[PDB]
């Protein structure tokens, strides 16, 4: 007379995975990774992110809350907090201590900026907190936010030591199974032989040439080309280097396997929840771009690691006893230099300094703009009051100046989003992404293909356009029929779907709805 439930559900989010990575490299994947999810599970091929900006902290938050920044409070990886008078990192919390490391900047993090509950929170509430909930990622934000407010543990990678650590928000000390894993020095083992392509490099016909102008550098090498023979020496000097290799994903999945065993995840009938973010596809993509040989090799190597991961699930939990959903927190644009080489619309988006000089000339006061980030601009309320300036005047001028920019498609006040002459889906995505306390006073929408000038190599992601917002969404295992769909869905539909499969209450700020055709 019990509610039918899987023994374990695994939430995998491949960082920066554009949907078309599934098919650009389709002919090179094996049978047990992405193709196992496609061939035995359900693929939603028309899922878009229903907010902006399409960055990491929000993506992981919205996947697991079914909510939007306007409600759940995570308005980006960073945001300007006008009451604190400074920019704020999404997970930074100076009321906790590092656990397993002495670095405060690496370990002082918590989910305290998250206002809405997660599906992992709701599982704990539905099982009287007998459920094992563990988050794993190289990035603090991508481990903490999916895990929720009261998980068994949330672990992330310490660049200063090469170990997985946590904070006193979770436990006073690292569990034995984490110390055991760290002491193996898996990172050293992985980078020992450098980085060569898994296949013969001549076969990477889905990619550009190896040496192109728009690709960044890795480690000590001064050309963006294989082979990366000095990886082991470079990793030793900077252990954060492993983030920008396929071995960062391999490390993460071995850590996730250690979490399954260290917490007995999936052995009894009480549903456990493992969340793991694969961050290296984002680091590699940021440095080399979606058309690089580097990125293609990262996905061929991730594909094999996922096959090993699913095979370990079959032995430790049992096929049919676990539920997997795979998605991404966002896509990515093509590199500006790549698009220019092929005549596609593209370009680059120092606004705070430049506009403040103009605002200075126009109104006579300096530092009128407090911050410019996430395609928004914040005005310094302290400067406006002391200078006797109106927010609307100062805002109207900046918007008029921004309309002149060749990269600007729309500019609008965040007080007047609904009435603006902007089509859907852009208008509602701007609404969903606008958090009253933590978002700026002006919203900017860039033309297609334009990227930030923060780095003129590699690529980035933040915009509404389909290349950033079109994410894969694959379900596999317990309670999932095989199939695929081109019906439109939202990222905020993921958590409601898992909630319905588990017969648990939806998260507290959820705005999405279950994907009914998946539940079979
Ligand atoms: Zn990301
Ligand atoms: Zn290259
Ligand atoms: Zn259990
Ligand atoms: Zn990124």
Curated annotation (Swiss-Prot):
The protein, known as: Alkaline phosphatase PafA
Any Pfam family hit: Phosphodiest
Taxonomic source organism: Elizabethkingia meningoseptica (Chryseobacterium meningosepticum)
Entry's cofactor comment: Binds 2 Zn(2+) ions.
pH-related activity note: Optimum pH is 8.5 with 4-nitrophenyl phosphate as substrate. Has 50% residual activity at pH 7.5 and 30% at pH 9.0, being virtually inactive at pH 10 and at pH 5 or lower.
Listed EC numbers: 3.1.3.1
Function per UniProt: Alkaline phosphatase with broad substrate specificity. Has phosphatase activity towards nucleotide phosphates with a preference for ATP. Active towards a great variety of phosphomonoesters with the exception of 2',3'-cyclic AMP and myo-inositol hexakisphosphate.
UniProt binding sites for substrate: 77, 139-141
Activity regulation, short description: Strongly inhibited by orthovanadate and EDTA. Also inhibited by inorganic phosphate.
Binding positions for Zn(2+) 1 per the UniProt entry: 15, 56, 329-330
Subcellular location: Periplasm
GO molecular function, one term: zinc ion binding
Cofactor: Zn(2+)
Keyword Phosphoprotein recorded: yes
Recorded catalytic activity of this chain's protein: a phosphate monoester + H2O = an alcohol + phosphate
Sections of the chain in a coiled coil: none
Active site: 56 (phosphothreonine intermediate)
Upper lineage: Bacteria, Pseudomonadati, Bacteroidota, Flavobacteriia, Flavobacteriales
Cross-referenced InterPro entries: Alkaline_phosphatase_core_sf (IPR017850), Alkaline_phosphatase_prok (IPR026263), Phosphodiest/P_Trfase (IPR002591)
Temperature dependence: Heat-labile. Incubation for 10 minutes at 50 or 60 degrees Celsius causes 40% and 60% inactivation, respectively. Heating at 100 degrees Celsius for 2 minutes causes total loss of activity. Heat-inactivated enzyme cannot be renaturated.
Recorded GO CC terms: periplasmic space
Induction: Expression is not repressed by inorganic phosphate.
